[PDB]
């Protein structure tokens, strides 16, 4: 029914969506527009192999340095999420220690959600959208770099096939931040109260926006399980790096590309 309680849940979805637009300049729509070839101004250049990697050149341990470079390039991402989170009603009133825990775990899952926006089944956008690195070229790289991205492409293709838009993703991301099961939380009940209300608004938003999917609410919450998995897969990745004593050599151009991913 259209009543005060629903109107408020549509008011929250709007407030979130507007905040989401202010915080995050690269929308999914902007990103999708580039992948499907709609942009004719300075179209992205494809890197699909070694020879094309040299041509695209004009625009510690190797693994540790890739990871430090991508964290530094992710500082602006972390800041924009924190800004987004401060606009979620009730967030700034939570224990300051808990705000940090929510965000310290949320960021990685949210960055993978946005990274899916940059991926299709052929590859991924890089260099602020001036490059397109193929999925098969990444998979073809030597161990252990060859396996870095391929679990994320598999996740990203399912997620993208649900056809969420920026309105959907704003509430989704707000559900991710206000997760009451993070380790170290002190006052779970106020976090869950917020999340419960955010889930009501997410449910409604998916009913009005996605008639073609009767269990899309369920399937989207399942995708939170899969996001945490990629995050745990990175920890394993660090152990595979420690044990590795094969030549960890990698073209400096590939290291720069990899500093653009996550």
């Amino acid at each position: 029914q259209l009543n005060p309680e629903s109107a408020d849940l549509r008011a929250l979805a709007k407030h979130l969506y507007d905040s989401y637009i202010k915080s995050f300049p690269l929308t999914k729509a902007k990103a999708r527009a580039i992948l499907t070839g709609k942009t004719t101004d300075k179209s992205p250049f494809v890197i699909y192999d070694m020879n094309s990697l040299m041509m695209g050149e004009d625009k510690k341990e190797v693994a540790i340095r890739i990871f430090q470079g991508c964290q530094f390039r992710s500082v602006e991402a972390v800041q924009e999420i924190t800004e987004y989170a401060k606009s979620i009603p009730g967030f700034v009133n939570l224990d300051l220690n808990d705000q940090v825990t929510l965000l310290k775990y949320g960021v990685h899952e949210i960055i993978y959600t946005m990274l899916a926006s940059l991926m299709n089944k052929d590859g991924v956008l890089i260099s602020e959208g001036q490059g397109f690195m193929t999925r098969e070229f990444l998979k073809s790289l030597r161990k252990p770099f060859g396996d870095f991205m391929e679990p994320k492409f598999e996740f990203a293709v399912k997620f993208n096939a649900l056809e969420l838009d920026d309105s959907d993703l704003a509430i989704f991301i707000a559900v991710i931040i206000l997760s009451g099961d993070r380790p170290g939380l002190l006052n779970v009940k106020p976090i869950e109260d917020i999340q419960d209300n955010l889930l009501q608004a997410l449910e409604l938003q998916l009913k009005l926006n996605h008639p073609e999917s009767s269990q899309l609410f369920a399937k989207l919450l399942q995708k939170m399980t899969d996001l945490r998995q990629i995050v745990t897969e990175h920890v394993q990745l660090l152990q595979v790096i420690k044990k590795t004593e094969t030549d960890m050599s990698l073209h400096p151009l590939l290291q720069e590309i990899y500093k653009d991913l996550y």
Binding site: Q71, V75, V78, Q79, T82, K86, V100, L103, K104, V107
Partner: peptide, 13 residues
């Protein structure tokens, strides 16, 4: 992570 939580704390300010 210690740097990460440091970035977050500065942002929340």
């Amino acid at each position: 992570n210690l740097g990460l939580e440091d970035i977050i704390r500065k942002a929340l300010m």
